[PDB]
């Protein structure tokens, strides 16, 4: 359907818009390139591990490669919905969001190639709870936006994508991987990549907060929706954590990683206010 006119012909970009300012920060701070990371020591590290040590690392990497690929693809309906609503500055910011996710996908796939597991099908480490989130709930919530961009639909999409997938699971996964391999002195290239990724994801969560809060600001009714959609997904979040915990104990303070996930989930709720 047609363009009515163009904001930068009728007027200008809204230079003070929060998402324009976030777009400006993303350009300044978004220069890293996964192609520049030296993975040669990660290759030696992985080869020195015993077979049992080798597969201990793979469930988390399997979870992150799919997470990053899913969020690369599944932000496109959000960008479409906000473009159709004329939210130009959100769209400009989301071009940096999408390109960040492309680099994140690339980083994990380069690591797999470098250490010699690119030919291994890591899907065996996606349990039913993981699939319910990443194969089903995430794409369903985002694709809804092509036919329903109501405030309820936008809140649900931002809740699943930004607050649960990125702000609870990915945030906790970064932390976990850092805890484990930083102390071991292992995989310096991957940890460099994760550091850059974590800096990017700081901006991404601000977009999710902005989006949910501006909708909640219209009607407190929507605060209770946000909380409900968070609680709806929790069983699958903790069900995936329980599965990773059960894998690792079979081959690290798990009670303290499990508590980081609970901490992050509750922190995301506190970043939205009923008013």
Ligand X SMILES: CCCCCCCC(=O)O
CA atoms of 160 and 158, how far apart (whole Å): 6
User: Among ligand X, its own copies, Fe ion, none, what does residue 153 contact (CB within 5–8 Å per kind)?
Assistant: none
CB of 162 to its own copies, least distance (A): 18
- What are the residues whose beta carbons fall under 8 Å from the beta carbon of 67, sequence distance 6 or more? 134, 165, 169, 170, 173
User: Among its own copies, ligand X, Mn ion, none, what does residue 257 contact (CB within 5–8 Å per kind)?
Assistant: ligand X
200 annotated as ligand-binding: no
CA atoms of 208 and 156, how far apart (whole Å): 11
- Kindly indicate which of the ranges 58-66, 188-196, 225-233, 237-245 contains the residues binding Fe ion, using the contact rule CB under 5 A: 237-245
User: Among ligand X, Fe ion, Mn ion, none, what does residue 143 contact (CB within 5–8 Å per kind)?
Assistant: none
What stretches of 116-216 show up as alpha helix (H) in DSSP?
A: 128-131, 138-143, 151-158, 171-184, 188-216
Binding residues for Mn ion, rule: CB under 5 A, are 68, 101, 104
User: Among its own copies, Fe ion, ligand X, none, what does residue 196 contact (CB within 5–8 Å per kind)?
Assistant: none
Q: Map the footprint of Fe ion across residues 137-196, applying CB under 5 A.
A: 166
Nearer to ligand X, 91 or 169 (CB): 169
For 52, other C-beta atoms within 10 Å of its C-beta total 8
Binding residues for ligand X, rule: CB under 6 A, are 60, 63-64, 67, 169-170, 172-173, 176, 241, 244-245, 257, 261
In whole angstroms, what separates CA 19 from the centre of its chain? 18
Q: Is 30 in the site for Fe ion (CB under 5 A)?
A: no
161 annotated as ligand-binding: yes
- How far, in Å, are 20, 35, 92, 212 from residue 95 at the CA level? 11, 20, 5, 19
CA atoms of 79 and 4, how far apart (whole Å): 18
User: Among ligand X, Fe ion, its own copies, none, what does residue 166 contact (CB within 5–8 Å per kind)?
Assistant: Fe ion
Binding residues for its own copies, rule: CB under 8 A, are 1-13, 15, 23-24, 27-28, 31, 33, 35, 62, 65-66, 68-70, 72-73, 76-77, 79-80, 83, 88, 91-92, 95-96, 98-99, 101-103, 105-106, 108-110, 112-113, 118-119, 121-123, 126, 134-136, 139-140, 143, 146
User: Among Fe ion, ligand X, Mn ion, none, what does residue 90 contact (CB within 5–8 Å per kind)?
Assistant: none
Breaks in the chain (C to N > 2.5 A) come right after: 251
- What are the residues whose beta carbons fall under 8 Å from the beta carbon of 19, sequence distance 6 or more? 87, 89, 90, 92, 93, 207, 210
Exposure string of 244-275, with b = 16+ CB inside 10 Å and e = fewer, is bbebbeeeeeeeebbebbeebbeebeeebeee
CB of 265 to ligand X, least distance (A): 11
CB of 117 to Mn ion, least distance (A): 20
* Residues in touch with Fe ion (CB under 5 A): 166, 201, 204, 239
Residues comprising the binding site for Fe(3+)? 68, 101, 104, 129, 161, 166, 201, 204
């Amino acid at each position: 359907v047609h363009h009515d006119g163009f904001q930068t012909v009728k007027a200008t970009i809204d230079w003070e818009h929060p998402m324009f300012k976030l777009y400006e920060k993303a350009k300044r701070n978004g220069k890293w390139n996964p192609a520049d990371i030296d993975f040669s020591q990660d290759q030696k590290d992985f080869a020195s591990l015993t077979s049992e040590e080798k597969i201990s690392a793979l469930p988390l990497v399997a979870g992150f490669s799919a997470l990053e690929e899913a969020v690369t693809l599944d932000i496109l309906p959000m960008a479409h919905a906000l473009a159709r609503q004329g939210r130009l500055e959100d769209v400009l910011f989301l071009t940096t969001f999408m390109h960040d996710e492309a680099k994140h996908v690339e980083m994990f796939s380069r690591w797999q190639q470098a250490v010699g597991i690119g030919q291994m099908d890591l899907s065996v480490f996606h349990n039913d709870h993981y699939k319910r989130i990443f194969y089903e709930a995430l794409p369903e919530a985002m694709n809804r936006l092509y036919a329903d961009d109501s405030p309820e639909a936008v809140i649900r999409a931002a809740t699943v994508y930004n607050m649960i997938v990125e702000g609870t699971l990915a945030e906790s996964g970064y932390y976990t991987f850092r805890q484990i391999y930083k102390k071991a002195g292992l995989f310096p290239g991957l940890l460099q990549g994760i550091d850059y990724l974590n800096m990017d994801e700081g901006r991404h969560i601000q977009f999710g907060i902005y989006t949910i809060q501006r909708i909640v600001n219209e009607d407190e009714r929507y605060y209770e929706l946000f909380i409900r959609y968070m609680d709806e997904l929790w069983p699958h979040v903790i069900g995936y954590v329980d599965y990773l915990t059960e894998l690792g104990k079979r081959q690290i303070d798990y009670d303290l990683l499990r508590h980081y996930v609970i901490k992050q989930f509750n922190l995301r709720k506190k970043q939205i206010s009923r008013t």
